[PDB]
């Protein structure tokens, strides 16, 4: 199908309590495969999926080296950002960076990404052209100027079109047993009396991978968007995910309501109703 690889990084400064903590995780689709935490007793890139374990010592050495260096660079950047925003050295601040690539069924690049946030706000992002920059404010424009001067975008593009897609394809092949298997949702509807006058119908989706899914309630074939409580998709802890959607329904009206489920693990979309 279509697939992604993403690396996430967060550094959080903590003045008075040592250097900023650096945590990074790597993902293919919704499967974590690597991690690194600077507060670990012996910090190193660590495996988190079975198919990445077969990579040799040279792999783990290279990735660990990169992580260790990125930790130091983030710390310099955090100091830079205090200057750009005229901020004091007493407060805690946050630098986030995501990059990675999307590929289609034939494994060709669909889209690359490389973007930063500071204190929870967009700072600078590589545009979809992988050649120009979007800076959120005048501080970020100083970064943009430096990155244009040094032709940084060209370097990122080369990684994003080359190594990002080539290694993602490698990982997809090596983990084909899990990464290229969609687990369909186990679905049912429950009924939860509120009063004499109404009850809740809750449509469940359980045990599904990947996380992307559509759950909706209709009444007389009309979407109940504004009256549906839809919880955030949540991890079960066994690689799969869970979600539910609930509507408040007048007594005796239950059979007017249908729940609709779309997941890539399902050949056709599902229609469910309350079955007493």
């Amino acid at each position: 199908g279509s697939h992604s690889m993403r690396y996430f990084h967060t550094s959080v400064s903590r003045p008075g309590r040592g250097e900023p903590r650096f945590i990074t995780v790597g993902y293919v689709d919704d499967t974590l495969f690597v991690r690194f935490d600077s507060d670990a007793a012996s910090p190193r890139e660590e495996p988190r999926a079975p198919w990445i374990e077969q990579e040799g010592p040279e792999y783990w050495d290279r990735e660990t080296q990169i992580c260790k260096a990125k930790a130091q660079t983030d710390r310099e950047d955090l100091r830079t950002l205090l200057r750009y925003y005229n901020q004091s050295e007493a407060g805690s601040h946050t630098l986030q960076n995501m990059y990675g690539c999307d590929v289609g069924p034939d494994g060709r690049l669909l889209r690359g990404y490389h973007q930063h946030a500071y204190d929870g706000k967009d700072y600078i992002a590589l545009n979809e052209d992988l050649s120009s920059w979007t800076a959120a404010d005048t501080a970020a424009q100083i970064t943009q100027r430096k990155w244009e001067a040094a032709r940084v975008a060209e370097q990122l593009r080369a990684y994003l079109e080359g190594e990002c897609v080539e290694w993602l394809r490698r990982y997809l092949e090596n983990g084909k047993e899990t990464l290229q298997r969609a687990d369909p949702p186990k679905t049912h509807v429950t009924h939860h009396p509120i009063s004499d006058h109404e009850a809740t119908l809750r449509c469940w989706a359980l045990g599904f991978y990947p996380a992307e899914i559509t759950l909706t309630w209709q009444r007389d074939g009309e979407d109940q968007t504004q009256d549906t409580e839809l919880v955030e998709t949540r991890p079960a802890g066994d690689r799969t995910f869970q979600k539910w959607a609930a509507v408040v329904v007048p007594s005796g009206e239950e059979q007017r309501y249908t729940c609709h489920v779309q997941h890539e693990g399902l050949p056709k979309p599902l229609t469910l109703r309350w079955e007493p």
Partner: peptide, 9 residues
Amino acid sequence: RRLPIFSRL
């Protein structure tokens, strides 16, 4: 496999 480039803000 990670980006080996570190571009300073």
